[PDB]
Amino acid sequence: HGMTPLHLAAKNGHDKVVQLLLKKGALFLSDHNGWTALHHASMGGYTQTMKVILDTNLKCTDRLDEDGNTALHFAAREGHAKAVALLLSHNADIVLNKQQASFLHLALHNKRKEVVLTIIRSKRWDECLKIFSHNSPGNKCPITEMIEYLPECMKVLLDFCMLHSTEDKSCRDYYIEYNFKYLQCYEPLTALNAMVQNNRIELLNHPVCKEYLLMKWLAYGFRAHMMNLGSYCLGLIPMTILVVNIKPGMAFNSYLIKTCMILVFLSSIFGYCKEAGQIFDISNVLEWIIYTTGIIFVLPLFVEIPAHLQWQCGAIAVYFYWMNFLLYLQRFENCGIFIVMLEVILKTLLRSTVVFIFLLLAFGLSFYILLNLQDPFSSPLLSIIQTFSMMLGDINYRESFLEPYLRNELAHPVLSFAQLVSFTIFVPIVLMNLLIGLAVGDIADVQKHASLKRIAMQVELHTSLEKKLPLWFLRKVDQKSTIVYPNKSLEMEILKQKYRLKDLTFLLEKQHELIKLIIQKMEIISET
Amino acid sequence: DISNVLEWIIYTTGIIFVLPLFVEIPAHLQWQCGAIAVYFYWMNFLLYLQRFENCGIFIVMLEVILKTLLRSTVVFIFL
Amino acid sequence: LLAFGLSFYILLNLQDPFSSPLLSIIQTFSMMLGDINYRESFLEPYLRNELAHPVLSFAQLVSFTIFVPIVLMNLLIGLA
Amino acid sequence: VGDIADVQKHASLKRIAMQVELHTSLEKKLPLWFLRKVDQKSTIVYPNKSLEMEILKQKYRLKDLTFLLEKQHELIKLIIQKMEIISET
């Protein structure tokens, strides 16, 4: 196979033979597949023998195999944290080699926890961040790979980003400093966008990232709504203060309404000045209704219109302004979840109303046919609205059933009561108890991961902004460091147990095979 | 066998509704038979959408609650 | 509530229980539970043609009766 | 709420189990010669138009482990059975 007795001695880790072979000139040969002996000491992590090799000649930390790997890779693959610490104790170079994968990434693909704890805790660390190749097909940054595989190593890395001094003793000046040099690399927010795609919630609740989002929020994110929503609120309020300060009947054409009339008119065509808004299709049809009927409302600034069509256009206007204003509060924090719940139930009900509109059509026609001569069932599309108005428990039953029954105005009396107890079972109880049960299942689904959802919403908001704002403006507003004065699991538990058991049974193989070897080579005379 | 009794009601009262195509009937019994007809047509039409994909689950939920309530209404009818 | 409260104030002004804002908006708050009157508020004015915008009001009403008594009150149960 | 969450517990399986019931109820009614031209058995698509099995996998690895420990321990009994000693007596 190519092996030379220095390599096998380092393969099974016996320090006393590897020192004497080096004392009798072992000459550090490379075998087939290029595995010099320090790779064998790394593959196994026999650090005592590794101390022997390093203290003699040092012409092995630079050797590459036929894969081009160093022994830092093979110590990281088998995950021997004492070995890499001994290797990083000396000046050991790092290369990307025939896979364009580096040393730190290779520790992460084998998911070895303890070595990358010791990597960041050791010195000579920041250049290992910088040595990851850009535009690599499998692993661009190491920090996004740490998000992809080992989140707890990211957590202790974030623990090094946060500083303290004078620990709440005077409590009037208390110093807390953060560092955000890790959350950068162009493409924005890459260390944080990786957290939500690998849905690592504890890293998002880590107080470095909360202060990191609060930096993006206070620099421009809170200012973004004040230019966005504040424009819309400038379109909103002069519609609303117009409708209160005039009666809904008459038509208009003092010294407060004329400026109010033009103000919604300019903001409507300001909405038409954009085909799409600058911040990233329910709102597209909604604003299009909003922008049409706003102009038609204040159209008596230019041409006379009848008051009937004017106020009709105001009805669609003021209803849909505040409806879309509810959609502008969707991208907030304290008010954000209740819109998301509201749209899920609305999307649940609207994909359910294509089913139960026939249920309404059944009772709607059957009440139209049973009790025609009453006024509230005098027509279809009056019987079917009344049936929709009786969904909640608004069955009238006195002026609709009893007071006509005792004067025998019921056409089919035994049928109508039989329809009614069928009705009062069907839509107010079993539909409305179905329709509650869809809500509780959907809201608990939302509240299952709501804390991740509002953060994933908020990091979406900045990344949708960051590809729109010019980068020269970014350069002065980013701070990348804060100074804070406060005086103003069961799945990964078993998964960690699986890797320890799989390592255990692998250690039992080499033990059993070696125990086969003592039987293969042991003399016997007395037992024969 | 819910549809078997349902169509059997559906098929009787349909004929009795349009029975003035052949023999004259009073209007009171005619429209009475139309009331059972148009109510149970759309009720069974809800059962034909049961075997669909986008509309399928809401019938299955509707029948479970109805089977829950109807095995409960033998108790609370005394209440 | 401000959307339907003004929209009912603008659609059916000439009734007494919507005769003013902060009377239309309390009545809209009182119609949260299923207290949509619908007889003396919609039907009995419609058959005498006292509705100013009839196709809009019913279109507002089925939008209303969906929105606040069902999906808000079923949201608000689901938070409980 | 208890019954709907029971339905939504396995609804995605339920609508599929409903749909495969629908075809199999049909397929034993349609004549097989009509089936022969309408089946295609190949498609061409243009888009431009767990915790239980985790422990269960761990049980089989542990049960194999303790079985490997039996043959190891029995063989380790065998080296004691056949090994000479003089100095320790």
Coordinates of N, CA and C in Angstrom, one line a residue, chain A residues 240 243-244 246-249 308 311-312 315-316 318-319 322-323 338 341-342 345-346 349 375-376 378 382 385-386 388-389 391-392 394 396 399-400 432 435-436 439-440 443 447, chain C residues 2-4 6-7 9-11 13 21 33-39 43 46-47 52-54 56 58 60-67 69-72 74-79:
Chain A
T240 N -60.0 61.6 5.4 CA -60.7 61.3 6.6 C -61.2 62.5 7.3
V243 N -64.3 63.9 5.3 CA -65.6 63.2 5.4 C -66.3 63.6 6.8
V244 N -65.5 63.9 7.8 CA -66.1 64.2 9.1 C -66.7 65.6 9.1
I246 N -68.0 67.5 6.7 CA -69.0 67.8 5.8 C -70.1 66.7 5.8
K247 N -71.3 67.1 5.5 CA -72.4 66.1 5.6 C -72.3 65.2 4.4
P248 N -72.6 63.9 4.5 CA -72.6 62.9 3.4 C -73.5 63.1 2.3
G249 N -74.4 64.1 2.4 CA -75.4 64.3 1.3 C -74.9 65.3 0.2
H308 N -74.5 62.2 -6.1 CA -74.8 60.8 -5.9 C -73.6 60.0 -6.3
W311 N -70.4 60.9 -3.7 CA -70.3 60.2 -2.4 C -70.2 58.7 -2.6
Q312 N -70.8 58.2 -3.6 CA -70.6 56.7 -3.9 C -69.1 56.4 -4.1
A315 N -67.4 56.4 -0.7 CA -67.7 55.2 0.1 C -66.6 54.2 -0.2
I316 N -66.3 53.9 -1.4 CA -65.3 53.0 -1.8 C -63.9 53.5 -1.3
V318 N -63.0 55.7 1.4 CA -62.6 55.8 2.8 C -62.7 54.4 3.4
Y319 N -63.4 53.5 2.8 CA -63.4 52.1 3.2 C -62.1 51.4 2.9
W322 N -58.5 52.8 4.8 CA -58.1 52.2 6.1 C -57.9 50.7 6.0
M323 N -58.5 50.1 5.0 CA -58.2 48.7 4.8 C -56.8 48.5 4.3
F338 N -50.7 40.2 14.2 CA -52.2 40.2 14.1 C -52.7 40.5 12.7
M341 N -52.1 36.7 11.2 CA -53.2 35.9 11.6 C -54.5 36.3 10.9
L342 N -54.7 37.5 10.6 CA -55.9 38.0 10.0 C -56.0 37.6 8.5
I345 N -56.7 33.5 8.4 CA -58.1 33.1 8.5 C -58.9 33.6 7.4
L346 N -58.5 34.8 6.8 CA -59.2 35.3 5.6 C -59.0 34.4 4.4
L349 N -61.0 31.2 5.1 CA -62.4 31.3 4.9 C -62.7 31.5 3.4
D375 N -91.9 40.0 3.7 CA -91.0 41.0 3.0 C -89.5 40.5 3.0
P376 N -88.9 40.0 4.1 CA -87.4 39.8 4.0 C -87.1 38.6 3.2
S378 N -88.8 38.2 0.0 CA -89.7 38.5 -1.1 C -89.0 38.3 -2.4
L382 N -82.5 38.5 -2.0 CA -82.9 39.0 -0.7 C -83.1 37.9 0.3
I385 N -79.4 37.0 1.0 CA -78.7 37.8 1.9 C -79.2 37.7 3.4
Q386 N -80.5 37.5 3.5 CA -81.1 37.3 4.8 C -80.6 36.0 5.4
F388 N -77.7 34.8 4.7 CA -76.3 35.1 5.2 C -76.3 36.0 6.4
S389 N -77.3 36.8 6.6 CA -77.4 37.6 7.8 C -77.9 36.7 9.0
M391 N -76.6 33.9 9.7 CA -75.5 32.9 10.0 C -75.1 33.0 11.5
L392 N -75.2 34.1 12.1 CA -74.6 34.3 13.4 C -75.5 33.9 14.6
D394 N -78.9 35.3 14.2 CA -79.9 36.4 14.0 C -81.2 35.8 13.4
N396 N -84.8 35.3 13.3 CA -85.7 36.2 14.0 C -86.7 35.5 14.7
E399 N -91.2 37.4 14.3 CA -91.8 38.0 13.2 C -91.7 37.3 11.9
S400 N -90.8 36.2 11.9 CA -90.6 35.4 10.7 C -91.3 34.1 10.8
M432 N -70.4 27.4 12.1 CA -69.7 28.4 12.9 C -68.8 27.7 13.9
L435 N -66.0 26.8 11.7 CA -65.2 27.9 11.3 C -64.4 28.5 12.4
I436 N -64.8 28.2 13.6 CA -63.9 28.5 14.8 C -62.8 27.5 14.8
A439 N -60.0 28.3 12.8 CA -59.2 29.4 13.3 C -58.2 29.0 14.3
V440 N -58.6 28.2 15.3 CA -57.7 27.8 16.3 C -56.6 26.9 15.8
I443 N -54.3 29.6 13.9 CA -53.6 30.5 14.8 C -52.5 29.9 15.6
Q447 N -48.7 30.9 15.7 CA -48.0 31.0 17.0 C -47.1 29.9 17.3
Chain C
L2 N -62.6 51.6 12.0 CA -62.6 52.9 11.4 C -63.0 52.8 9.9
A3 N -62.7 51.7 9.3 CA -63.0 51.5 7.9 C -64.5 51.4 7.7
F4 N -65.1 50.4 8.4 CA -66.6 50.2 8.3 C -67.3 51.3 9.0
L6 N -66.7 54.6 9.1 CA -66.9 55.7 8.2 C -67.7 55.3 7.0
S7 N -67.4 54.0 6.5 CA -68.1 53.6 5.3 C -69.6 53.4 5.5
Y9 N -71.1 55.3 7.7 CA -71.6 56.6 7.9 C -71.8 57.3 6.6
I10 N -71.0 56.9 5.6 CA -71.1 57.6 4.3 C -72.2 56.9 3.4
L11 N -72.5 55.6 3.7 CA -73.4 54.9 2.8 C -74.9 55.2 3.3
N13 N -76.4 57.5 5.7 CA -76.4 58.6 6.6 C -77.7 58.9 7.2
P21 N -70.5 60.6 12.8 CA -69.4 59.8 13.2 C -69.3 59.9 14.8
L33 N -70.7 41.7 17.5 CA -71.0 40.4 18.0 C -72.0 39.6 17.2
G34 N -72.7 40.2 16.3 CA -73.8 39.6 15.6 C -75.0 40.3 15.8
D35 N -74.9 41.6 16.2 CA -76.0 42.5 16.4 C -76.3 43.3 15.1
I36 N -76.0 42.8 14.0 CA -76.4 43.4 12.7 C -77.9 43.4 12.7
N37 N -78.5 44.6 12.6 CA -79.9 44.7 12.7 C -80.6 44.2 11.5
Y38 N -80.2 44.7 10.3 CA -80.5 44.2 9.0 C -82.0 44.3 8.6
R39 N -82.9 44.5 9.5 CA -84.3 44.7 9.2 C -84.6 46.2 9.1
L43 N -83.3 46.2 5.3 CA -84.4 45.8 4.5 C -85.5 46.7 4.4
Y46 N -84.8 49.5 2.4 CA -84.5 49.2 1.0 C -85.8 49.0 0.2
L47 N -86.8 48.4 0.8 CA -88.1 48.2 0.1 C -88.9 49.5 0.0
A52 N -79.4 55.1 0.0 CA -78.8 56.0 -1.0 C -78.1 55.2 -2.1
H53 N -77.3 54.2 -1.7 CA -76.5 53.4 -2.6 C -76.8 51.9 -2.3
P54 N -77.8 51.3 -2.9 CA -78.3 50.0 -2.5 C -77.4 48.9 -2.8
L56 N -74.2 49.0 -3.1 CA -73.0 49.2 -2.3 C -73.2 48.7 -0.8
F58 N -75.3 46.5 0.6 CA -75.3 45.1 0.7 C -74.0 44.5 0.4
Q60 N -71.3 46.1 1.1 CA -70.6 46.4 2.3 C -71.0 45.5 3.4
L61 N -72.2 45.1 3.5 CA -72.7 44.3 4.6 C -72.2 42.9 4.6
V62 N -72.2 42.2 3.4 CA -71.6 40.9 3.4 C -70.1 40.9 3.5
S63 N -69.5 42.1 3.2 CA -68.1 42.3 3.5 C -68.0 42.5 5.0
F64 N -68.9 43.2 5.6 CA -68.9 43.4 7.1 C -69.1 42.1 7.8
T65 N -70.2 41.4 7.5 CA -70.6 40.2 8.2 C -69.6 39.1 8.0
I66 N -68.8 39.1 7.0 CA -67.6 38.3 7.0 C -66.6 38.8 7.9
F67 N -66.3 40.1 7.9 CA -65.0 40.6 8.5 C -65.0 40.6 10.0
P69 N -67.7 39.9 12.5 CA -68.2 38.9 13.4 C -67.6 37.6 13.2
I70 N -67.2 37.3 12.0 CA -66.6 36.0 11.8 C -65.1 36.0 11.9
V71 N -64.3 36.7 11.0 CA -62.9 36.4 11.1 C -62.2 37.2 12.2
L72 N -62.7 38.3 12.6 CA -62.1 38.9 13.8 C -62.5 38.1 15.0
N74 N -63.4 35.1 15.3 CA -62.7 33.8 15.3 C -61.2 33.9 15.4
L75 N -60.7 35.0 15.0 CA -59.3 35.3 15.4 C -59.2 35.5 16.9
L76 N -60.1 36.2 17.4 CA -60.0 36.7 18.8 C -60.3 35.5 19.8
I77 N -61.1 34.5 19.3 CA -61.2 33.3 20.1 C -59.9 32.5 20.0
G78 N -59.2 32.5 18.8 CA -58.0 31.7 18.6 C -56.8 32.3 19.4
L79 N -56.9 33.5 19.7 CA -55.8 34.1 20.6 C -56.1 33.7 22.0

